[PDB]
Amino acid sequence: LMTPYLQFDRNQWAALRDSVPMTLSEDEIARLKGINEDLSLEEVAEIYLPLSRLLNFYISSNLRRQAVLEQFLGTNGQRIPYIISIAGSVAVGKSTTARVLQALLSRWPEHRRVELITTDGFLHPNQVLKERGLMKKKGFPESYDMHRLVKFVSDLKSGVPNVTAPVYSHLIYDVIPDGDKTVVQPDILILEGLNVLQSGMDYDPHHVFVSDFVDFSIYVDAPEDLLQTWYINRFLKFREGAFTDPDSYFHNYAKLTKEEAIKTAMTLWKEINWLNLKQNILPTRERASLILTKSANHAVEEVRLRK
Amino acid sequence: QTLMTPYLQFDRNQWAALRDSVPMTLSEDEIARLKGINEDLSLEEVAEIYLPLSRLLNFYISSNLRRQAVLEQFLGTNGQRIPYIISIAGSVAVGKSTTARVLQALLSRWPEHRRVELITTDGFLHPNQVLKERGLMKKKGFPESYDMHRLVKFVSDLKSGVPNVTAPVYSHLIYDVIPDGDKTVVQPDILILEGLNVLQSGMDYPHDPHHVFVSDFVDFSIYVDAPEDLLQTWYINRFLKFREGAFTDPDSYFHNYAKLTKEEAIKTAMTLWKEINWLNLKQNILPTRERASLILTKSANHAVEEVRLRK
Numbered sequence: 363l364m365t366p367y368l369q370f371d372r373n374q375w376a377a378l379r380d381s382v383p384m385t386l387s388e389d390e391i392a393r394l395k396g397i398n399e400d401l402s403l404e405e406v407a408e409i410y411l412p413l414s415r416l417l418n419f420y421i422s423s424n425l426r427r428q429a430v431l432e433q434f435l436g437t438n439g440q441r442i443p444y445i446i447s448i449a450g451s452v453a454v455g456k457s458t459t460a461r462v463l464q465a466l467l468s469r470w471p472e473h474r475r476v477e478l479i480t481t482d483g484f485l486h487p488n489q490v491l492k493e494r495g496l497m498k499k500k501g502f503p504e505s506y507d508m509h510r511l512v513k514f515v516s517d518l519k520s521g522v523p524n525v526t527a528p529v530y531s532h533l534i535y536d537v538i539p540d541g542d543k544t545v546v547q548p549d550i551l552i553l554e555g556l557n558v559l560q561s562g563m564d565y566d567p568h569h570v571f572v573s574d575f576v577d578f579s580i581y582v583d584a585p586e587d588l589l590q591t592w593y594i595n596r597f598l599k600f601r602e603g604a605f606t607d608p609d610s611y612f613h614n615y616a617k618l619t620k621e622e623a624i625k626t627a628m629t630l631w632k633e634i635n636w637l638n639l640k641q642n643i644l645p646t647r648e649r650a651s652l653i654l655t656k657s658a659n660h661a662v663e664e665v666r667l668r669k
Numbered sequence: 670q671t672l673m674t675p676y677l678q679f680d681r682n683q684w685a686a687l688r689d690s691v692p693m694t695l696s697e698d699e700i701a702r703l704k705g706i707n708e709d710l711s712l713e714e715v716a717e718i719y720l721p722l723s724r725l726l727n728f729y730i731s732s733n734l735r736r737q738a739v740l741e742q743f744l745g746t747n748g749q750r751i752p753y754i755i756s757i758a759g760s761v762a763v764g765k766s767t768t769a770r771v772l773q774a775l776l777s778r779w780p781e782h783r784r785v786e787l788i789t790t791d792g793f794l795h796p797n798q799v800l801k802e803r804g805l806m807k808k809k810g811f812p813e814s815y816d817m818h819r820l821v822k823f824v825s826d827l828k829s830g831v832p833n834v835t836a837p838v839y840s841h842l843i844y845d846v847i848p849d850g851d852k853t854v855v856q857p858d859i860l861i862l863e864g865l866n867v868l869q870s871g872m873d874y875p876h877d878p879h880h881v882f883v884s885d886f887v888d889f890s891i892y893v894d895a896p897e898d899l900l901q902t903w904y905i906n907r908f909l910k911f912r913e914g915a916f917t918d919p920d921s922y923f924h925n926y927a928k929l930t931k932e933e934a935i936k937t938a939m940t941l942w943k944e945i946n947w948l949n950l951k952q953n954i955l956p957t958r959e960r961a962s963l964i965l966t967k968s969a970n971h972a973v974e975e976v977r978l979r980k
C-alpha cells in the first residue's frame with residue numbers, strides 16, 4: 363500500500379541543510395532548553411537547519427493553506443502571516459522545538475517578526491473546567507476555549523487592529539485573570555499546544571477549528587514508554603523548582619518523598635495525559651506536514667515529511 | 670457567526686460569477702451526449718456550475734503540483750507525477766454519474782490536455798454470489814457490499830505508479846460484476862472516483878476504525894446533494910425509464926419489471942427505494958455530506974441552485 367510520508371534518518375535529513383548558515387551561538391541555544399530537555403548545537407544544525415530551509419522555501423513560494431481560495435475569489439492585499447503549528451504529547455519537548463524554530467526563523471533569510479503563541483493560554487479557567495467537571499481532563503480538546511483560539515488566529519491573520527491573547531500560569535495552574543497581552547501582527551506565527559491538529563474529522567459535526575488556518579504543522583513524536591519516564595523525570599525536577607514555591611498550586615508535591623513523587627507522577631500520566639495521548643493526540647500524528655521522532659536521548663533520529 | 674461554520678455558501682449567480690474567463694471546451698451536442706437517464710444537463714449548467722468548478726479544481730491541481738516542485742528542489746531529486754484524485758459521492762439517482770462525466774470532459778481539455786480516468790466504484794462491488802453468502806443483497810450499495818481492500822489497493826497502485834493495474838467492471842444488465850470483465854487502467858493525470866462509498870472513513874462506525882479507506886487517497890471530494898423527497902421521485906421516474914429501456918432486454922436481471930403495469934412499477938420502485946436505497950441514504954450517505962470539499966445541491970429541475978465550499 364502507498365504511504366503519504368517520506369522517511370529520512372538523521373544523516374539523510376541533516377544532509378538537506380545545504381548551505382543555510384547558522385544564526386545562533388551555543389550560549390543562545392542552551393538558554394532555549396526546556397526542563398529535562400536537551401538541545402545541542404548538532405541538533406540545531408542537523409535537524410532544525412534543514413527544517414528552516416524547507417520551511418523557508420514554502421514561505422517564499424506563497425503556498426499557503428488558504429492561497430487557492432483567495433485566488434479563486436480574490437487575492438486582495440495578502441501580506442498574510444505564515445502560520446506554523448507545533449503539536450505532540452505533554453513532556454515530548456514541543457516547547458523547545460517552538461523556541462528554537464522561532465529563533466532561527468527570526469534571523470535566517472532576513473529578519474522576520476515571528477510570534478510564538480502557546481495554546482494553553484486558551485484553556486478554560488479552572489473555574490469553568492470545575493463547573494463542567496472537566497479537570498481530570500486538562501489538556502483534552504474540550505478543556506480549551508477554541509471559539510476564542512480560532513477567533514484569535516483569524517483576527518491576527520486577517521490583520522485586525524488590537525488583538526490580545528490570554529496567558530497561562532503554571533504556578534497557579536490556571537490562566538491569569540487579567541493577564542491578556544496584545545499581539546502585534548507578525549510575519550510568522552508559531553502556534554504550540556496539544557490541540558493544534560484537531561479537526562472535525564477525527565471527531566465534530568462541523569464547527570471550525572484552528573488547524574484550518576495553519577499552513578505547516580509539525581508533530582513532535584516519541585514512543586509511549588519514553589514519554590512516560592520523561593513525564594515522571596520532568597515532574598521530579600518540578601519538585602526541585604517550580605513546586606518549591608509556596609504559592610505553587612502543587613506546592614504539596616514538593617514535600618513528597620522521591621518515591622511518592624514517582625508514584626504521584628505515574629498516576630497523573632496514566633490517568634490523564636496518557637488518555638489524551640491515545641485518544642486525541644496519536645490519531646492526529648499522521649496528519650502533520652512533518653513528524654519529528656526522538657529517541658531516549660531526546661534527539662530526533664527520524665524525520666517523516668508528508669509528500 | 671460566519672467566521673466559523675466550515676462551509677462557504679453561494680447561490681447560482683454567486684457561484685457562476687466565479688467562472689471568470691475559463692472558456693468552454695464543449696459543444697451543445699457533446700454535452701447532450703453526457704446526460705444520464707432522467708437527468709437534464711444544459712449548456713448553462715455547464716457554464717454556470719461546472720466551469721467555475723473547473724477553475725477552482727484547476728487552482729488546486731497546480732498548487733498541489735507547485736508543492737511537489739519545492740519539495741523536489743528541497744530533496745534534490747525528481748520524477749514526481751502523482752495523479753490528482755477527485756471523488757464524487759451522493760445518493761443513488763442523484764445524478765452523480767452525469768457530474769463525473771462532464772467534469773471528466775472539461776478537465777480533459779481545459780488548461781491543457783490531461784488524461785483523466787473515470788472509475789466507478791460499483792465495479793468493486795462483491796459479486797451477487799458473495800453478497801448472497803453473506804446475506805447482503807438487500808444491501809447492494811451499502812459500504813459492506815463493496816470489496817474495498819481491493820478498491821484501496823487499486824487506487825494506491827494507480828497513484829503510486831504500479832505497472833499493470835486493472836479494475837473490475839460492473840454490468841447493470843446482469844445486475845452484477847462481469848466475471849472476466851477486468852480492464853487495464855493506465856496511470857492518468859487525474860482520476861475521478863465515483864461511487865456511493867467514496868467518502869467512507871474511520872469516523873463511520875468507530876470499531877477498529879484502524880483500517881484504511883479509499884477516501885484517504887482522495888485530494889478533493891464532491892458530494893451531489895438533493896432532498897429526500899426529490900430523490901425518491903427521481904428514483905421512481907428513472908425506474909420507469911428503465912422499464913422502457915434496459916429492462917426490455919430479455920437477458921436483463923430485471924426483465925420481469927418490464928412487464929409490470931405502470932402502477933405496479935411505481936409500487937415496486939417505491940419499496941425498492943424505501944427499503945434499500947433510502948436506508949443507505951440516511952445511514953451511510955447523508956452522514957458523509959458535511960465532510961466533502963464541495964457540495965452541489967440540486968432542485969426539482971435537476972439543476973444546482975446552491976453550492977457549499979469547505980473553507
Ligand SMILES: CC(C)(COP(=O)(O)OP(=O)(O)OC[C@H]1O[C@@H](n2cnc3c(N)ncnc32)[C@H](O)[C@@H]1OP(=O)(O)O)[C@@H](O)C(=O)NCCC(=O)NCCS
Binds near residue numbers: 453
Ligand atoms: C497545562 C498543561 C496542559 C500544559 O501541557 P502541554 O501543552 O502539553 O505542554 P507541555 O506539557 O509540553 O509543557 C510545556 C511547558 O510547561 C512546563 N510545564 C508543564 N506542566 C507544568 C507544571 N505543572 N508546572 C510547571 N511547569 C510545567 C514545561 O516545563 C514546559 O516548558 P519548558 O520549555 O520551560 O520546559 C499540563 O501541564 C497540565 O496541566 N496537564 C494535565 C495533568 C497534569 O499533568 N497536571 C499537572 C500536574 S503537576
Ligand SMILES: CC(C)(COP(=O)(O)OP(=O)(O)OC[C@H]1O[C@@H](n2cnc3c(N)ncnc32)[C@H](O)[C@@H]1OP(=O)(O)O)[C@@H](O)C(=O)NCCC(=O)NCCS
Binds near residue numbers: 704707841864945
Ligand atoms: C448498482 C447500484 C448500486 C448503483 O448505484 P450508484 O452508485 O448509486 O449509482 P446510480 O444509482 O447513480 O446509477 C449510476 C448509473 O447506473 C444506471 N443504473 C442504476 N441502476 C440501474 C439499473 N438497475 N439498471 C440499469 N441502469 C442502472 C443509471 O442510469 C446511471 O447511469 P447514467 O449516467 O447512464 O444514467 C444500484 O443500481 C443498485 O443496485 N441498488 C440497490 C437496490 C436497487 O435499486 N436495485 C436495482 C433495482 S432495479
